[PDB]
Structure 1
Amino acid sequence: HHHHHHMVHITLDRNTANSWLIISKDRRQVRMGDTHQNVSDNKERFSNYPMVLGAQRFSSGKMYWEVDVTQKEAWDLGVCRDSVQRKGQFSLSPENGFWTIWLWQDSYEAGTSPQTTLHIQVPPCQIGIFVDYEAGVVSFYNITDHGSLIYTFSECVFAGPLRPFFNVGFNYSGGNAAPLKLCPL
């Protein structure tokens, strides 16, 4: 792909984080803490899952960023509407305002309803995410495999401003403590 020149500097929005997340000082890394991180509750925080949003809002144009997923067993990545549900249980789907892929139990899947199996020969250590607002496209790229395409959502109906979306996943296994990191431009 040749989307690198639409690179944007993403930072994480602390106020949206699940209360167990630890966001670095530079707001570029997030990991699961082993306990509640001693923050007050608010209506923005994802309550049920280890999720956080980027601070940036996109309503036009082409945007690209990269995320490091090295040594994680589980995570979700993509974009979502600014107005997605924060509280309670929900599925990651375009009907609910999410355009995402994930790793879970040694398989990669796109967050369609129902989910779609992905075909990845080289397990990615960094994921590239491209959004074309006007075209209604969200694409995912395997940076470890020379930028090969993972998945394209097309005919997207965003229906609002978009935010970068992250889920560090649970760490029930003791094998998923590693952070998500926003990679430098």
Structure 2
Amino acid sequence: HHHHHHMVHITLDRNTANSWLIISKDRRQVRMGDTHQNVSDNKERFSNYPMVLGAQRFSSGKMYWEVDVTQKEAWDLGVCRDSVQRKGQFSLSPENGFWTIWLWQDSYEAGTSPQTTLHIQVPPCQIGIFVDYEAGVVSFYNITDHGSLIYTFSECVFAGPLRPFFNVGFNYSGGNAAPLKLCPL
């Protein structure tokens, strides 16, 4: 792909984070803590899952960023509406305002309803995410495999400002402690 020139500098929004997440000083890395991180509750925090939003809001244009997923067993990545549900249980779907892919139990799937199997020969260590607001497109790229396409959501109905979306996943196994990292431009 040739989307690198739309690169944007994403930072994480501490106020949206699940209360167990630990965000680095530079707001570029996030990981699951082994306990509550001693923050107050607020209506923005994701309560049920280890999720956080980017601070940036997008309502036009073309945007590109990259995320490092090295040594993780489970994660979700993509974009979502600014007005997604924060509290309680929900599924990641375009109907609920999410355009995401994930790793879970050694398989990769796109967050359609129902979910779509992805075909990845080279497990990615870094994911590229491309958003074309006007076209209604969210695309995912395998940076480890020379930028090969993973998945394209087209005919997207964003219906609001978009935010970068992250889920570090649970660490029930002891094998999923590694962080998500926003990779330099």
Give per-residue Cα distances to partners, 1:161-180, cap 9 Å, x unaligned: 00000000000000000000
CA distance in 2, matches of 1:38, 1:145: 40
CA distance in 2, matches of 1:151, 1:36: 35
**Structure 1 residue 149: Cα displacement:** 0.1
**Structure 1 residue 106: Cα displacement:** 0.1
**Identity value in percent:** 100
Name the Cα RMSD after superposition: 0.0
**Structure 1 residue 19: Cα displacement:** 0.1
**Structure 1 residue 137: Cα displacement:** 0.0
**Structure 1 residue 111: Cα displacement:** 0.0
Give per-residue Cα distances to partners, 1:47-103, cap 9 Å, x unaligned: 000000000000000000000000000000000000000000000000000000000
Q: Does 2:131 align with 1:131?
A: yes
Give per-residue Cα distances to partners, 1:1-60, cap 9 Å, x unaligned: 000000000000000000000000000000000000000000000000000000000000
Match of 1:42 in 2: 42
TM-score, structure 2 length as denominator?
Answer: 1.00
After TM superposition, what 4+ stretches of structure 1 lie above 6 angstroms from structure 2?
none
CA distance in 2, matches of 1:80, 1:59: 12
3-state SS of paired residue (1:12): coil
Q: Which structure 2 segments of 5+ residues have no match?
A: none
CA distance in 2, matches of 1:38, 1:4: 38
CA distance in 2, matches of 1:180, 1:138: 20
CA distance in 1, matches of 2:172, 2:99: 25
**Structure 1 residue 181: Cα displacement:** 0.0
Give per-residue Cα distances to partners, 1:86-136, cap 9 Å, x unaligned: 000000000000000000000000000000000000000000000000000
Q: Which structure 1 segments of 5+ residues have no match?
A: none
CA distance in 2, matches of 1:112, 1:180: 22
CA distance in 2, matches of 1:75, 1:3: 23
CA distance in 1, matches of 2:15, 2:94: 24
CA distance in 1, matches of 2:147, 2:43: 37
